[model samples]
Target: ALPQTVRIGTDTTYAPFSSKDAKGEFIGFDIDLGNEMCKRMQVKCTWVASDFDALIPSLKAKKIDAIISSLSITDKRQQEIAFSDKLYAADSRLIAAKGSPIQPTLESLKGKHVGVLQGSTQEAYANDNWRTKGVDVVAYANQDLIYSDLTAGRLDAALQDEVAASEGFLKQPAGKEYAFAGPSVKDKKYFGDGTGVGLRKDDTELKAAFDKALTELRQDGTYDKMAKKYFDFNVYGD
Candidate 1:
């Protein structure tokens, strides 16, 4: 029931989930998972990179057939689109310069400049919980830019997916001066469920195919094998 070639939209700035390599080729967990899923489903697929904020709009505009970004399955988003089964659990944390005393709270962040990836759940959370209370929640077009700004002292802290920040930033030499400033942030309302493959609300058959393939990957050990290549913990979540 899927098309001959599925055009998957992704924001390539969030490395370890979706990003381009040194050669400008797509790489990381999402790309690998999508390739495996397409192989399992025997469908051809192409990856399209876009600004984080444009993913949903591009999908709705019929520019892409699916979205394989680190898209979270949330009540707010589910109202406009559907999603495949949960891909992996997503947790966000605040990272600041080493030894900085920043917490993911309105009071702690008040008057401090914080960065968030535009259109991401972190952005929504920061806006809802901290921005209104005087936190300078700055939205960046990409995670890389946020990291750059943080390194340059333009941002006091950055909120992003814990795992992504780890592999994409914290683990890199450029992030040596930064560390987690607080424990994981939590909010049932904004963060929502874990990450999933975004799809059109009416694409039931495609959703079913993706769900089945994802489940099979989890059961067949393919998921763990791929995840272990980048992480040491159970990324599948509880």
Candidate 2:
């Protein structure tokens, strides 16, 4: 039995956020930060891999203590679960084939096929804004597949969290065929003000501990270091 251990849930397929490395080990920024958090709290940490859509349900079922996935915070989700204070903030960005003339803006995507993660805030945004305009917003179980479709020319564009789109895709060989385009869609109303550690709605004590740890990490510049390492700037919140 692992004592002082807290179960952390995540999707194992979302690279640059959370995923299994070539050695079949769970490794990524989120997993690292979760371990650091448990270290600060003097608690042991264990990670559980599951589908992205089941993150909340697993929390509700008491299968995990918290979710450290790249789960974005939104008003609707907040009603169902508690969230640690903002850990990182990111917005959606669009990527398309080079020289495809796709504007990558919300309006420009009115008649195109867009891809997003199913049951994610990005999915909700794509559906509400694009689907009604005759644009087909395809939902996927993982991020890499979305890029796969985009590269195969099966999609006009794909919307994804900014950091992953840049670090995970733009730096890869397959992604060389695409370029990020469009106005940055920074709508907190939909995309969320930031990413947060998800907790069961009643787990206030654990949430409080995480919130405090995040504050310490931020005040001591640890958060900044991580932010810079992963993004163009400290795109942590707001």
Candidate 3:
């Protein structure tokens, strides 16, 4: 049943999408999008932070009404819960130290330690392709740790969303030495259709609400306004 107040679950470790600011307040693209959505729906929105890997479980347990943590809309996830229309689009890629002759191929990455966020499509892609081909795929609970290990030389390369890696790491001083090592990863079997809001399959009404709200935001230029504030390119994609 839809409640008067909506509880949204998110993992705050991902920057530009959802993270806590210096004032200890939740802020990011997803956070603002959800806030705007709740305002239009006439519902109070509350942000609940949770581990990246535990978001789905928490939602199914009824601990949160929806998840807006840049969660991808994949077939495996569809079997567990329904997803609203695409909130934004992103692709995956590998990152390596500057001037490094690395690529996202079996021959290029063989025997190298690669990092990915646990339970993410990047991890799945690595395990399914790179791991079997001799890449040591390392999975972390969040993106920061992956970048930490990559910068520390603990990882030879890392796989993650292009936008996140660009805004959250690559553009920063810590990641100045790192650059995209390969072409974008866009296989639907791995990265899924796009990022979306996750809700229980039974919450059809709530799902419809999110879909409509997102469309309205797009039509009224609210989405473009928010996107421009965070990114120079169209995050919604073609």
Model 2 lDDT per residue over 1-238, tens place: 2237799999977767788998989987788778778877777788999888988999999999899888888898998999998777777888888776777565677768899998888888878878877888899987878988888889889888877888788888888878887767677789877788999887778887888777787789787777565567666655
Model 3 has how many clashing residue pairs? Answer: 0
Candidate lDDT scores, in order, read 0.91, 0.82, 0.91
After the best TM-score superposition of candidate 3, give how far the Cα of residue 152 lies from its true spot, in angstroms: 0.7
Question: In candidate 1, which residue ranges exceed 4 Å CA deviation?
Answer: none
Alpha-carbon TM-score of each model against the true structure: 0.98, 0.92, 0.97
Query: How many Å off is the CA of 202 in candidate 2?
Result: 0.6
**Least well predicted 10-residue stretch by lDDT in candidate 3:** 185-194
Q: Tell me, what's the RMSD of every candidate?
A: 0.8, 2.3, 1.0
What is candidate 1's TM-score against the reference? 0.98
Q: Can you give the lDDT of residue 150 in candidate 2?
A: 84
Encode model 3's per-residue lDDT on 1-238: one tens digit a residue: 4579999999998888998999889989999999999888778889999988899999999999999999999998999999999999988988999898999888988999999899888888899999987889999998889999999999999998888888988998898989999789778887888899999999999998988999999999999998999999889987
User: In model 2, which runs have C-alpha deviations exceeding 4 angstroms?
Assistant: 1-3, 104-107
Return the candidate ranking by TM-score, descending: 1, 3, 2
lDDT of 3 at 102: 94
lDDT value for candidate 3? 0.91
